[PDB]
mmCIF file of C-alpha atoms and ligand atoms in Angstrom:
data_model
loop_
_atom_site.group_PDB
_atom_site.id
_atom_site.type_symbol
_atom_site.label_atom_id
_atom_site.label_comp_id
_atom_site.label_asym_id
_atom_site.label_seq_id
_atom_site.Cartn_x
_atom_site.Cartn_y
_atom_site.Cartn_z
ATOM 1 C CA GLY Z 1 -22.000 -20.218 20.270
ATOM 2 C CA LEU Z 2 -21.374 -16.694 18.361
ATOM 3 C CA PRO Z 3 -18.992 -16.788 15.257
ATOM 4 C CA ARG Z 4 -15.169 -17.091 16.278
ATOM 5 C CA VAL Z 5 -13.064 -14.722 14.826
ATOM 6 C CA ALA Z 6 -8.629 -14.196 15.662
ATOM 7 C CA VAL Z 7 -7.829 -10.648 15.882
ATOM 8 C CA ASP Z 8 -3.298 -10.144 15.161
ATOM 9 C CA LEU Z 9 -2.081 -8.134 17.403
ATOM 10 C CA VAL Z 10 0.221 -5.352 16.263
ATOM 11 C CA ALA Z 11 3.048 -3.506 18.856
ATOM 12 C CA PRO Z 12 2.089 0.163 19.462
ATOM 13 C CA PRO Z 13 2.123 3.190 19.031
ATOM 14 C CA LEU Z 14 0.316 0.952 16.178
ATOM 15 C CA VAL Z 15 -2.688 -1.233 16.625
ATOM 16 C CA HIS Z 16 -4.257 -3.292 15.095
ATOM 17 C CA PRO Z 17 -6.844 -3.159 11.677
ATOM 18 C CA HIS Z 18 -10.576 -3.132 12.433
ATOM 19 C CA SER Z 19 -13.626 -1.007 11.106
ATOM 20 C CA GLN Z 20 -15.071 1.598 13.620
ATOM 21 C CA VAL Z 21 -18.965 1.302 13.006
ATOM 22 C CA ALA Z 22 -19.164 -2.629 12.213
ATOM 23 C CA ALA Z 23 -22.947 -3.672 10.859
ATOM 24 C CA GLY Z 24 -21.216 -6.755 12.315
ATOM 25 C CA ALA Z 25 -22.918 -8.940 14.911
ATOM 26 C CA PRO Z 26 -21.945 -9.891 18.501
ATOM 27 C CA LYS Z 27 -18.460 -12.126 18.035
ATOM 28 C CA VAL Z 28 -15.996 -14.200 20.141
ATOM 29 C CA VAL Z 29 -12.440 -12.503 19.244
ATOM 30 C CA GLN Z 30 -9.529 -14.279 19.615
ATOM 31 C CA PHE Z 31 -6.307 -12.575 21.182
ATOM 32 C CA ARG Z 32 -2.900 -14.424 22.465
ATOM 33 C CA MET Z 33 -0.419 -12.861 24.029
ATOM 34 C CA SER Z 34 3.521 -14.553 25.564
ATOM 35 C CA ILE Z 35 4.384 -12.409 28.895
ATOM 36 C CA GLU Z 36 8.358 -11.327 27.794
ATOM 37 C CA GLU Z 37 11.004 -10.022 31.085
ATOM 38 C CA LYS Z 38 13.546 -8.647 29.621
ATOM 39 C CA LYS Z 39 16.261 -5.955 30.045
ATOM 40 C CA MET Z 40 15.974 -2.988 28.403
ATOM 41 C CA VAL Z 41 18.228 0.715 28.166
ATOM 42 C CA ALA Z 42 15.311 2.786 29.231
ATOM 43 C CA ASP Z 43 17.354 6.285 28.486
ATOM 44 C CA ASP Z 44 19.977 7.932 26.642
ATOM 45 C CA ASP Z 45 23.476 7.315 29.294
ATOM 46 C CA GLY Z 46 22.837 3.992 28.902
ATOM 47 C CA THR Z 47 20.900 3.682 31.907
ATOM 48 C CA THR Z 48 18.397 0.148 32.048
ATOM 49 C CA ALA Z 49 15.389 -1.523 33.139
ATOM 50 C CA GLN Z 50 14.110 -4.730 34.587
ATOM 51 C CA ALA Z 51 11.469 -4.911 32.763
ATOM 52 C CA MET Z 52 8.231 -7.070 32.318
ATOM 53 C CA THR Z 53 6.279 -6.739 29.119
ATOM 54 C CA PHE Z 54 3.143 -7.778 27.238
ATOM 55 C CA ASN Z 55 4.455 -9.707 23.905
ATOM 56 C CA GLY Z 56 7.548 -7.812 24.537
ATOM 57 C CA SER Z 57 6.775 -4.156 25.071
ATOM 58 C CA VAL Z 58 6.270 -1.610 27.044
ATOM 59 C CA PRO Z 59 3.594 -0.949 26.180
ATOM 60 C CA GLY Z 60 1.193 -3.863 26.020
ATOM 61 C CA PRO Z 61 -0.513 -4.253 21.890
ATOM 62 C CA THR Z 62 -3.848 -2.787 23.058
ATOM 63 C CA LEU Z 63 -6.928 -4.878 22.214
ATOM 64 C CA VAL Z 64 -9.627 -3.684 20.062
ATOM 65 C CA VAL Z 65 -12.964 -5.215 20.274
ATOM 66 C CA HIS Z 66 -16.609 -3.537 19.642
ATOM 67 C CA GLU Z 67 -19.554 -3.013 22.444
ATOM 68 C CA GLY Z 68 -20.668 -6.620 22.774
ATOM 69 C CA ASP Z 69 -18.315 -8.984 21.792
ATOM 70 C CA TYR Z 70 -16.561 -11.054 23.698
ATOM 71 C CA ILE Z 71 -12.931 -11.337 24.609
ATOM 72 C CA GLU Z 72 -11.011 -14.527 24.426
ATOM 73 C CA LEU Z 73 -7.053 -14.236 24.560
ATOM 74 C CA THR Z 74 -4.431 -17.023 26.302
ATOM 75 C CA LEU Z 75 -2.183 -15.639 27.619
ATOM 76 C CA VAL Z 76 1.389 -17.470 27.700
ATOM 77 C CA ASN Z 77 4.246 -17.870 29.936
ATOM 78 C CA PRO Z 78 7.104 -19.263 28.607
ATOM 79 C CA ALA Z 79 9.466 -21.303 30.836
ATOM 80 C CA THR Z 80 11.919 -19.191 30.324
ATOM 81 C CA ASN Z 81 10.912 -16.039 32.124
ATOM 82 C CA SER Z 82 10.654 -17.216 36.451
ATOM 83 C CA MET Z 83 7.932 -14.594 37.628
ATOM 84 C CA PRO Z 84 4.483 -15.485 37.497
ATOM 85 C CA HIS Z 85 2.137 -13.863 35.925
ATOM 86 C CA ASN Z 86 -2.050 -13.020 34.642
ATOM 87 C CA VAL Z 87 -4.021 -10.051 33.034
ATOM 88 C CA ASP Z 88 -6.735 -7.527 35.427
ATOM 89 C CA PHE Z 89 -8.669 -5.867 32.200
ATOM 90 C CA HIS Z 90 -10.104 -2.581 34.021
ATOM 91 C CA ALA Z 91 -12.875 -4.025 31.382
ATOM 92 C CA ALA Z 92 -14.113 -7.792 32.432
ATOM 93 C CA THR Z 93 -16.262 -7.648 35.465
ATOM 94 C CA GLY Z 94 -15.729 -10.302 37.944
ATOM 95 C CA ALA Z 95 -12.793 -12.380 39.546
ATOM 96 C CA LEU Z 96 -11.027 -8.752 39.536
ATOM 97 C CA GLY Z 97 -11.327 -8.243 36.009
ATOM 98 C CA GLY Z 98 -10.036 -12.215 35.192
ATOM 99 C CA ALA Z 99 -6.876 -11.509 37.295
ATOM 100 C CA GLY Z 100 -7.509 -14.769 39.474
ATOM 101 C CA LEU Z 101 -8.432 -17.143 36.476
ATOM 102 C CA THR Z 102 -4.963 -16.584 34.413
ATOM 103 C CA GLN Z 103 -2.987 -17.119 37.236
ATOM 104 C CA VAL Z 104 -0.165 -18.750 34.719
ATOM 105 C CA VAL Z 105 4.049 -19.308 36.607
ATOM 106 C CA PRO Z 106 7.123 -20.071 34.265
ATOM 107 C CA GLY Z 107 5.485 -22.799 31.781
ATOM 108 C CA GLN Z 108 2.391 -22.050 31.830
ATOM 109 C CA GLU Z 109 -0.573 -21.347 29.963
ATOM 110 C CA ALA Z 110 -4.371 -19.794 30.580
ATOM 111 C CA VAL Z 111 -7.152 -18.575 28.514
ATOM 112 C CA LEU Z 112 -10.223 -16.301 29.124
ATOM 113 C CA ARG Z 113 -13.457 -15.083 27.492
ATOM 114 C CA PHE Z 114 -15.246 -12.315 29.544
ATOM 115 C CA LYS Z 115 -17.979 -10.554 27.260
ATOM 116 C CA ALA Z 116 -16.746 -6.958 26.527
ATOM 117 C CA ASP Z 117 -20.157 -5.219 26.843
ATOM 118 C CA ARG Z 118 -18.658 -1.725 28.292
ATOM 119 C CA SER Z 119 -17.527 0.557 25.773
ATOM 120 C CA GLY Z 120 -14.368 2.506 26.060
ATOM 121 C CA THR Z 121 -10.725 2.335 26.341
ATOM 122 C CA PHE Z 122 -9.701 1.035 29.381
ATOM 123 C CA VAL Z 123 -6.190 -0.508 30.436
ATOM 124 C CA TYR Z 124 -4.977 -3.469 31.198
ATOM 125 C CA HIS Z 125 -2.294 -5.323 33.716
ATOM 126 C CA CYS Z 126 -0.424 -8.266 35.351
ATOM 127 C CA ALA Z 127 -1.378 -8.033 38.852
ATOM 128 C CA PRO Z 128 0.144 -11.112 39.981
ATOM 129 C CA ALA Z 129 -0.540 -11.057 44.585
ATOM 130 C CA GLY Z 130 1.730 -9.539 45.940
ATOM 131 C CA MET Z 131 3.462 -8.260 43.170
ATOM 132 C CA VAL Z 132 1.181 -5.690 41.654
ATOM 133 C CA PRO Z 133 2.737 -2.843 41.859
ATOM 134 C CA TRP Z 134 6.027 -4.354 41.330
ATOM 135 C CA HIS Z 135 4.776 -5.488 37.976
ATOM 136 C CA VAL Z 136 2.583 -3.196 36.939
ATOM 137 C CA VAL Z 137 5.616 0.151 37.197
ATOM 138 C CA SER Z 138 7.927 -2.444 35.263
ATOM 139 C CA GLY Z 139 6.279 -2.130 32.540
ATOM 140 C CA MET Z 140 2.874 -5.064 32.568
ATOM 141 C CA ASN Z 141 0.376 -3.408 30.925
ATOM 142 C CA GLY Z 142 -1.884 -2.039 27.143
ATOM 143 C CA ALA Z 143 -5.052 -0.664 26.774
ATOM 144 C CA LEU Z 144 -8.084 -2.485 25.341
ATOM 145 C CA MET Z 145 -10.329 -0.839 22.947
ATOM 146 C CA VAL Z 146 -14.197 -0.711 22.607
ATOM 147 C CA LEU Z 147 -15.982 0.988 19.937
ATOM 148 C CA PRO Z 148 -19.366 1.563 20.242
ATOM 149 C CA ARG Z 149 -21.120 -0.908 17.474
ATOM 150 C CA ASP Z 150 -22.181 2.492 15.872
ATOM 151 C CA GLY Z 151 -18.863 4.224 15.771
ATOM 152 C CA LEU Z 152 -18.022 7.069 17.889
ATOM 153 C CA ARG Z 153 -19.620 9.904 18.255
ATOM 154 C CA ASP Z 154 -20.168 13.393 19.428
ATOM 155 C CA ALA Z 155 -21.841 15.668 22.726
ATOM 156 C CA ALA Z 156 -25.008 15.079 19.981
ATOM 157 C CA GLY Z 157 -25.028 12.001 17.905
ATOM 158 C CA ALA Z 158 -23.520 13.201 15.095
ATOM 159 C CA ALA Z 159 -21.366 10.433 13.692
ATOM 160 C CA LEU Z 160 -17.266 11.150 14.537
ATOM 161 C CA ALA Z 161 -14.373 8.942 12.292
ATOM 162 C CA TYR Z 162 -10.458 8.671 12.301
ATOM 163 C CA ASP Z 163 -8.616 8.609 9.673
ATOM 164 C CA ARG Z 164 -5.173 7.230 11.988
ATOM 165 C CA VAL Z 165 -5.325 6.080 15.703
ATOM 166 C CA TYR Z 166 -1.831 5.966 17.713
ATOM 167 C CA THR Z 167 -1.700 4.750 21.271
ATOM 168 C CA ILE Z 168 1.066 6.154 23.038
ATOM 169 C CA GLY Z 169 1.355 4.476 27.261
ATOM 170 C CA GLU Z 170 3.271 6.554 29.495
ATOM 171 C CA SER Z 171 5.549 3.895 32.241
ATOM 172 C CA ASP Z 172 6.559 6.192 34.904
ATOM 173 C CA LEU Z 173 9.731 4.256 36.483
ATOM 174 C CA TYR Z 174 11.817 3.825 39.625
ATOM 175 C CA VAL Z 175 15.273 3.152 39.000
ATOM 176 C CA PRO Z 176 17.296 2.786 41.965
ATOM 177 C CA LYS Z 177 20.678 4.671 42.023
ATOM 178 C CA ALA Z 178 23.636 3.968 43.841
ATOM 179 C CA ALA Z 179 25.612 5.019 46.045
ATOM 180 C CA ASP Z 180 27.592 7.007 43.678
ATOM 181 C CA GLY Z 181 23.981 7.900 42.523
ATOM 182 C CA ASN Z 182 25.286 5.859 39.345
ATOM 183 C CA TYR Z 183 21.470 4.486 38.965
ATOM 184 C CA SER Z 184 22.708 0.506 39.875
ATOM 185 C CA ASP Z 185 22.508 -1.978 37.058
ATOM 186 C CA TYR Z 186 20.943 -4.956 38.073
ATOM 187 C CA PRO Z 187 21.516 -9.015 36.701
ATOM 188 C CA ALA Z 188 18.631 -11.189 37.333
ATOM 189 C CA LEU Z 189 15.226 -9.078 37.530
ATOM 190 C CA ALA Z 190 15.048 -10.261 41.307
ATOM 191 C CA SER Z 191 17.895 -8.548 42.386
ATOM 192 C CA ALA Z 192 16.414 -5.389 41.124
ATOM 193 C CA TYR Z 193 13.019 -5.877 43.015
ATOM 194 C CA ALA Z 194 14.471 -5.434 46.662
ATOM 195 C CA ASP Z 195 16.007 -2.053 45.582
ATOM 196 C CA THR Z 196 12.945 -0.793 42.960
ATOM 197 C CA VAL Z 197 10.378 -0.949 46.070
ATOM 198 C CA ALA Z 198 12.354 0.934 48.218
ATOM 199 C CA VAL Z 199 12.830 3.710 45.506
ATOM 200 C CA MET Z 200 8.440 3.105 44.559
ATOM 201 C CA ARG Z 201 8.079 4.143 48.365
ATOM 202 C CA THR Z 202 9.798 7.360 47.875
ATOM 203 C CA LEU Z 203 6.751 8.650 45.411
ATOM 204 C CA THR Z 204 8.610 9.922 42.622
ATOM 205 C CA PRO Z 205 9.967 8.670 39.072
ATOM 206 C CA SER Z 206 13.087 8.340 38.217
ATOM 207 C CA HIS Z 207 12.706 8.529 34.906
ATOM 208 C CA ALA Z 208 9.153 9.228 33.648
ATOM 209 C CA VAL Z 209 8.673 7.332 30.012
ATOM 210 C CA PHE Z 210 6.417 6.794 26.451
ATOM 211 C CA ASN Z 211 6.996 3.928 24.879
ATOM 212 C CA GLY Z 212 9.474 1.619 26.306
ATOM 213 C CA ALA Z 213 12.548 4.865 26.301
ATOM 214 C CA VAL Z 214 13.731 8.007 26.571
ATOM 215 C CA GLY Z 215 13.510 9.159 22.945
ATOM 216 C CA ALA Z 216 10.775 6.698 21.855
ATOM 217 C CA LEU Z 217 8.401 8.460 19.430
ATOM 218 C CA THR Z 218 10.545 11.139 18.154
ATOM 219 C CA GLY Z 219 12.945 10.771 15.264
ATOM 220 C CA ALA Z 220 12.540 7.720 13.307
ATOM 221 C CA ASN Z 221 10.427 6.611 15.084
ATOM 222 C CA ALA Z 222 8.287 10.160 15.902
ATOM 223 C CA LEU Z 223 3.946 10.017 14.725
ATOM 224 C CA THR Z 224 3.458 10.406 11.336
ATOM 225 C CA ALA Z 225 -0.002 12.594 9.684
ATOM 226 C CA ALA Z 226 -1.242 14.606 6.861
ATOM 227 C CA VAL Z 227 -2.738 17.933 7.641
ATOM 228 C CA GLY Z 228 -6.018 17.213 7.050
ATOM 229 C CA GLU Z 229 -6.551 13.642 9.022
ATOM 230 C CA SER Z 230 -8.249 12.998 11.707
ATOM 231 C CA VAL Z 231 -6.524 11.036 14.286
ATOM 232 C CA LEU Z 232 -7.075 9.086 17.651
ATOM 233 C CA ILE Z 233 -3.972 9.337 20.340
ATOM 234 C CA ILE Z 234 -5.363 6.670 23.354
ATOM 235 C CA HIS Z 235 -3.148 7.621 26.021
ATOM 236 C CA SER Z 236 -2.529 5.141 28.818
ATOM 237 C CA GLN Z 237 -1.334 5.542 32.530
ATOM 238 C CA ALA Z 238 -2.067 2.389 34.054
ATOM 239 C CA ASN Z 239 0.097 4.028 38.162
ATOM 240 C CA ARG Z 240 -0.139 7.442 37.876
ATOM 241 C CA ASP Z 241 -1.597 10.542 36.445
ATOM 242 C CA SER Z 242 -0.424 12.338 33.514
ATOM 243 C CA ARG Z 243 -2.170 15.986 31.343
ATOM 244 C CA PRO Z 244 -1.123 14.688 27.970
ATOM 245 C CA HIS Z 245 -0.733 17.856 25.292
ATOM 246 C CA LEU Z 246 -0.141 18.706 22.313
ATOM 247 C CA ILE Z 247 1.975 21.144 21.641
ATOM 248 C CA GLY Z 248 0.236 23.443 18.659
ATOM 249 C CA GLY Z 249 -2.605 21.368 18.330
ATOM 250 C CA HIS Z 250 -5.393 21.117 20.205
ATOM 251 C CA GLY Z 251 -8.189 18.162 22.600
ATOM 252 C CA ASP Z 252 -10.928 18.457 19.545
ATOM 253 C CA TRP Z 253 -13.493 15.924 21.212
ATOM 254 C CA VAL Z 254 -12.309 14.073 24.407
ATOM 255 C CA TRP Z 255 -12.668 10.803 26.606
ATOM 256 C CA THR Z 256 -10.570 12.299 29.055
ATOM 257 C CA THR Z 257 -12.097 9.459 30.973
ATOM 258 C CA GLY Z 258 -12.035 6.924 28.240
ATOM 259 C CA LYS Z 259 -15.440 6.280 28.360
ATOM 260 C CA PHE Z 260 -17.373 6.280 24.859
ATOM 261 C CA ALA Z 261 -20.658 6.365 26.026
ATOM 262 C CA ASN Z 262 -19.933 9.498 28.020
ATOM 263 C CA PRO Z 263 -20.793 13.170 25.607
ATOM 264 C CA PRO Z 264 -16.726 14.157 24.538
ATOM 265 C CA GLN Z 265 -15.676 17.862 25.372
ATOM 266 C CA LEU Z 266 -14.380 19.819 22.980
ATOM 267 C CA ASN Z 267 -11.652 22.321 22.496
ATOM 268 C CA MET Z 268 -9.108 20.441 25.452
ATOM 269 C CA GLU Z 269 -6.007 22.887 25.928
ATOM 270 C CA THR Z 270 -4.504 20.106 27.950
ATOM 271 C CA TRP Z 271 -6.529 17.434 29.233
ATOM 272 C CA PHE Z 272 -6.042 14.762 31.763
ATOM 273 C CA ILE Z 273 -5.817 10.893 32.518
ATOM 274 C CA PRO Z 274 -6.714 9.665 36.345
ATOM 275 C CA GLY Z 275 -3.188 6.688 37.114
ATOM 276 C CA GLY Z 276 -5.270 3.491 36.404
ATOM 277 C CA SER Z 277 -7.283 4.094 33.319
ATOM 278 C CA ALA Z 278 -7.188 5.473 29.942
ATOM 279 C CA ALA Z 279 -8.540 8.336 27.397
ATOM 280 C CA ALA Z 280 -8.705 8.880 24.103
ATOM 281 C CA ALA Z 281 -8.357 12.613 22.582
ATOM 282 C CA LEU Z 282 -9.667 12.973 18.672
ATOM 283 C CA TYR Z 283 -7.354 16.042 16.377
ATOM 284 C CA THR Z 284 -7.484 16.378 13.115
ATOM 285 C CA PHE Z 285 -4.999 18.062 11.733
ATOM 286 C CA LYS Z 286 -4.465 21.809 10.034
ATOM 287 C CA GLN Z 287 -1.015 22.967 9.834
ATOM 288 C CA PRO Z 288 2.267 21.216 8.649
ATOM 289 C CA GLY Z 289 5.119 20.530 10.527
ATOM 290 C CA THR Z 290 6.409 19.427 14.132
ATOM 291 C CA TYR Z 291 4.507 18.285 16.915
ATOM 292 C CA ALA Z 292 4.990 17.418 20.210
ATOM 293 C CA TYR Z 293 2.478 15.399 22.186
ATOM 294 C CA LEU Z 294 3.529 15.793 25.953
ATOM 295 C CA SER Z 295 2.801 15.456 29.479
ATOM 296 C CA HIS Z 296 1.813 19.499 30.034
ATOM 297 C CA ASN Z 297 3.684 18.945 33.950
ATOM 298 C CA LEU Z 298 6.817 20.406 32.042
ATOM 299 C CA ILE Z 299 9.275 18.871 34.016
ATOM 300 C CA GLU Z 300 7.630 15.422 33.842
ATOM 301 C CA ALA Z 301 7.923 16.200 29.989
ATOM 302 C CA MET Z 302 10.786 17.270 29.111
ATOM 303 C CA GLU Z 303 13.292 17.063 32.416
ATOM 304 C CA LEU Z 304 12.140 12.776 32.582
ATOM 305 C CA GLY Z 305 10.860 11.953 29.245
ATOM 306 C CA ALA Z 306 7.181 12.226 28.197
ATOM 307 C CA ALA Z 307 6.786 13.831 25.196
ATOM 308 C CA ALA Z 308 7.312 12.658 21.694
ATOM 309 C CA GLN Z 309 6.651 13.754 18.266
ATOM 310 C CA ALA Z 310 4.056 13.473 15.341
ATOM 311 C CA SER Z 311 5.422 14.656 11.823
ATOM 312 C CA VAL Z 312 2.884 16.082 9.909
ATOM 313 C CA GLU Z 313 2.666 16.732 5.724
ATOM 314 C CA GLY Z 314 0.876 19.290 4.579
ATOM 315 C CA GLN Z 315 -0.265 22.982 3.297
ATOM 316 C CA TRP Z 316 0.655 25.726 5.495
ATOM 317 C CA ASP Z 317 -2.370 27.765 6.140
ATOM 318 C CA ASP Z 318 -1.422 31.419 6.618
ATOM 319 C CA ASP Z 319 -5.097 32.432 8.018
ATOM 320 C CA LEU Z 320 -4.435 30.253 11.543
ATOM 321 C CA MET Z 321 -1.085 31.754 11.478
ATOM 322 C CA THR Z 322 1.822 34.131 10.036
ATOM 323 C CA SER Z 323 4.819 35.582 11.466
ATOM 324 C CA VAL Z 324 3.704 39.179 10.504
ATOM 325 C CA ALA Z 325 7.024 40.484 11.370
ATOM 326 C CA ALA Z 326 10.146 38.443 11.432
ATOM 327 C CA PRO Z 327 12.421 37.820 15.058
ATOM 328 C CA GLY Z 328 15.230 40.841 14.190
ATOM 329 C CA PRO Z 329 15.759 44.605 14.698
ATOM 330 C CA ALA Z 330 16.874 45.987 11.656
HETATM 331 CU CU1 CU H 1 3.682 -9.981 36.214
HETATM 332 CU CU1 CU H 2 -6.448 -2.094 38.018
#
């Protein structure tokens, strides 16, 4: 040289713691882680896944820181576981972131560282190579954151714150288934892876868720818171896207993317885220119750898952518302 520281861690959702613102210164821271893977479951048924894551968871844791510172871481892976991992982151720169370096494987571880710177929230995440895615888716991753320183614121410136936171894451896833358908388962892882891837491719897823598962957150777991317060948430895723958212518520513020620187825106519703990344947112618450957271789409958330838741518490018122018446027628 510166110172360283360481831281711790925791888981888711938651975161851891821381513161925101511161013163312180830167430184470194540391852381560690571980891764784981595982397986688981896712848802418830059971378913588961495996896953992966870182620690464990888903898602892863886250871381935171611131811106510147650186861271460291370480891573581881273980052994046990297986695978490897690583881571991437987001954030840172280079390588990628770281991744390469880281790677680781298983056992181983490583560480780384870176620175942171930137711121816111962113895522881481795995991867490884091939694977990455697977990972891332598974788971993983877461876120871271850163824141610134010162713280936151618105647109214107013113310131713102928251319290718381938471975270968530888412895742997505894927697973596967067977033939018958258923778914497947496985154990281992690887076986698973292959287937896853295938578924993734386708894309778608398965588932988504947130954290892881478904438920987771828721118840217990778921988350928481218260018414018033514020818261923151963150878321894441890675891958894817888513968106877220928451428911018731718204956112317030935112951122978305996340870163822171720117512105935121316011218210828203838802947112977104993217895937990868994360974111964141814131818221617160018112018323119470529960718530838821978631995404919205628803378906995815518811268906797948994503878502968741947261718771718251417280018181119521019535016025616002019522019823017146119631229804128825016577
Ligand atoms: Cu991994
Ligand atoms: Cu990435």
